Paper text:
While chemical methylation of an amide bond uses a strong base to generate the imidate, OphA, the precursor protein of the fungal peptide macrocycle omphalotin A, self-hypermethylates amides at pH 7 using S-adenosyl methionine (SAM) as cofactor.
In the R72A-SAM complex (rmsd of 0.7 Å over 720 Cα atoms with OphAΔC6-SAH), peptide bonds of the substrate residues i−1 and i are flipped 180° relative to the conformation observed in OphAΔC6 and Y63F-SAH. Although the side chain of residue i+1 sits in the same pocket as seen in the OphAΔC6 protein, its backbone has a different hydrogen bond arrangement. Despite the large conformational change in substrate peptide, conformations of other OphAΔC6 residues are essentially unaltered, pointing to rigidity at the active site. We speculate that the flipped conformation of the substrate (seen in R72A, Y98A, and Y76F SAM complex structures) resembles an intermediate arrangement that occurs during translocation.
Residue numbers in the entry:
A (entry chain B): 7 to 385, 396 to 403
B (entry chain A): 7 to 388, 393 to 407
Write the structure that this text describes.
């Protein structure tokens, strides 16, 4: 209703490639773009996509508090929203993951009654999972800012993943163009030694920022982090991953109340699904091809899709319109204003496809796009993860 | 040297738009594509981008263990890798976040000496942060699978964010096409009552899967989750967000070791940085425009970029090649195989740009694309000494 909007989007971590299709489309559509990114290829790429961009990075300065910079960054965006423009703010990675000015600007915009939305992006933690070959679900994940971790004495779990952002700037309030002197780093190492022990592994992680670079995935002991040559390697794009120390056992009361037991059984805490976490100290080898695995693979020769499976059965015209709604913010806005009007103007849709667009309900769109078998409907069927 | 590769990529959560540019380019470049996605528009989109796709979802069945299905899905991918093909597996969201077969397939491919890589994507947790307007950094974030949370008695922190995936299938071991009766949901609700109290908020979160839909961001008390009408709403794509019950105070020893109070002390721990988390119970109003904020804004009129600021100073030819390397997997592989030959054949690069690309060093590329000041070039010679952005979470910093 009110003129003016703020859409905050991400670029991902690795230059250009980790930007989402929707982030790109919003950058292109914006009246004005404000950006804070940390590699020039991504900056150059953004400038090719919109003629009215402002680099927010110029609002940092030596001995200028980060908070004054962030107040300024968010005010530059919100000023343009107040003038009635469709504004896009761009921050590297996920624009809401360890970022101050995005949240400020959106909350101000929202409080003054403008449309305000954050679009998710690929974070450094997303890259971490991908590059270190770990899954937050197994065995759970604790994520902290390193200074907050120390100052608020945040709990660790030795049975779960621990991820620490900003380990290169422990206790730092003021910006500096030649980087952080991280001489309170030893305080973090003290905490890690107390929680995990001197010989426990810490993985120093830096996601590749350019498409041809390898990630840094260097394992050190907690004690090695005290060596000057090693502590020097930790910088402003460094994250630590600390693997679990032990496997947590199962709670017999919950096992009973969930009915996961037929008489006596033995699914051990150390009996793991392949593959095991390679960073975790003293983890045994797990066999990828056990007899049960071999038997499942043997069944592939006789495989047919089951009766209840729903094959895709759509059309070029329907696929085109669903793609357009995802990749054209203008088309989406029109559809959102008037389902019926929009749906009538779409060429080459079948009566079912048109009807389904008119309603906009998930089931109608699903039936138009998937053949639902008879065996299924005599009862929206989803995959999960076993941990 | 060994022929064949496995690249596993995500599609994000919201249909089509949340796919990354690199996920798309790998899908297009693949010899064979294997996918597991949960909306038809994303599925249809994938099929327009590659001619040799296989839907992995057909390997689920009633009375077939999930583990057997996952062994099968991974083996379909790795079989094609062993034949020397560039294979791409595709999973919705981030392909390594609450997903079994991706990790298995990659670990096998890696162990047998094939090129193997996972490309990250946008997870449901990423969507959650964006839609619920929260930052994992403030005040820290614990993320669990709901059944594992109960069975292993995983610890909560009442001072940090808690995110629980798979709240719609508590204790469920068998696959079935017609969904699941979440009959053991009450076991989760008891644990949440124990940890947080009956009146503590729980946010039922479902990210929009189609671009036109709105997310579900429905706040309930723990007690309200016992009502059948409310419990019925929690399904297979439901995640719970539980906000902090209290703010944690600061440690005086660390405040002293980090030298964060020259004057002694201030009088507050809940004098928050704007904005506050609007899901927290009894969160006070935070002032966005304090006198210090107004003073910072007043300085915008006279602002000039500092001397040390590095303006972009590149060329179309350089921007084009860096974009190509990011969006064309074949160009990237060629470049990686021989930096110098690749660099020689790029048209219209300046001598510095060519030299930078020949080396491949990130510092050299940066210096070819930005007008660097002497002081920053001085510091780099005698780890990367650049000012990078950082978040402030602790008010006293
Ligand atoms: C202000 S935050 C911004 C994070 C960003 N919004 C994201 O989505 O990851 C800066 C911190 O993110 C992490 N980070 C940024 N780039 C990284 C990279 N290439 N590899 C590993 N961690 C990184 C580091 O912990 C760094 O101190
Ligand atoms: C097997 S996992 C796969 C997760 C996916 N790889 C990702 O990156 O989020 C399924 C679980 O993810 C979460 N999930 C999936 N889709 C979601 C949505 N649209 N909104 C909220 N949570 C979702 C739910 O917790 C669900 O039970």
């Amino acid at each position: 209703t009110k003129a003016g909007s703020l859409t905050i989007v991400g670029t991902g971590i690795e230059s250009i490639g980790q930007m989402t299709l929707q982030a790109l489309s919003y950058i292109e559509a914006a009246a004005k773009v404000f950006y804070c990114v940390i590699d020039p290829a991504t900056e150059a790429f953004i400038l090719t996509k919109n003629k009215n961009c402002v680099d927010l990075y110029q609002y940092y300065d030596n001995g200028k508090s980060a908070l004054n910079t962030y107040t300024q960054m968010s005010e530059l965006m919100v000023r343009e929203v107040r003038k009635g423009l469709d504004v896009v703010g761009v921050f590297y990675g996920h624009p809401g993951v360890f970022v101050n000015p995005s949240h400020r600007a959106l909350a101000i915009a929202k409080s003054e009654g403008y449309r305000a939305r954050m679009l998710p992006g690929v974070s450094a933690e997303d890259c971490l999972f991908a590059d270190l070959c770990i899954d937050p679900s197994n065995p759970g994940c604790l994520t902290y800012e390193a200074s907050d971790f120390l100052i608020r004495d945040r709990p660790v779990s030795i049975h779960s993943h621990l991820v620490l952002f900003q380990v290169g700037c422990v206790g730092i309030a003021d910006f500096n163009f030649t980087g952080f002197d991280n001489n309170k780093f030893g305080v973090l190492v003290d905490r890690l030694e107390q929680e995990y022990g001197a010989e426990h592994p810490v993985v120093h992680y830096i996601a590749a920022m350019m498409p041809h670079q390898d990630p840094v995935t260097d394992k050190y002991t907690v004690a090695q982090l005290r060596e000057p040559e090693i502590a020097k390697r930790v910088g402003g794009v460094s994250t630590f991953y600390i693997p679990p120390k032990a496997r947590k056992a199962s709670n017999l009361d919950i096992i009973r109340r969930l009915e996961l037991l037929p008489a006596g059984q033995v699914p051990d805490k150390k009996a793991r699904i392949y593959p095991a976490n390679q960073w975790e100290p003293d983890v045994p080898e797990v066999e990828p091809y056990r007899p049960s695995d071999q038997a499942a693979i043997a069944q592939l020769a006789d495989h047919a899709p089951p009766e209840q499976y729903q094959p895709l059965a759509t059309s070029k015209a329907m696929s085109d319109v669903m793609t357009k709604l995802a990749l054209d913010p203008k088309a989406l806005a029109d559809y959102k204003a008037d389902h019926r009007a929009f749906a009538q103007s779409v060429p080459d849709l079948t009566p079912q496809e048109r009807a389904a667009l008119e309603l906009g309900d998930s089931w109608a769109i699903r039936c138009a796009m998937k053949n639902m078998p008879s065996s299924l409907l005599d009862a929206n069927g989803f995959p999960w993860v076993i941990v």
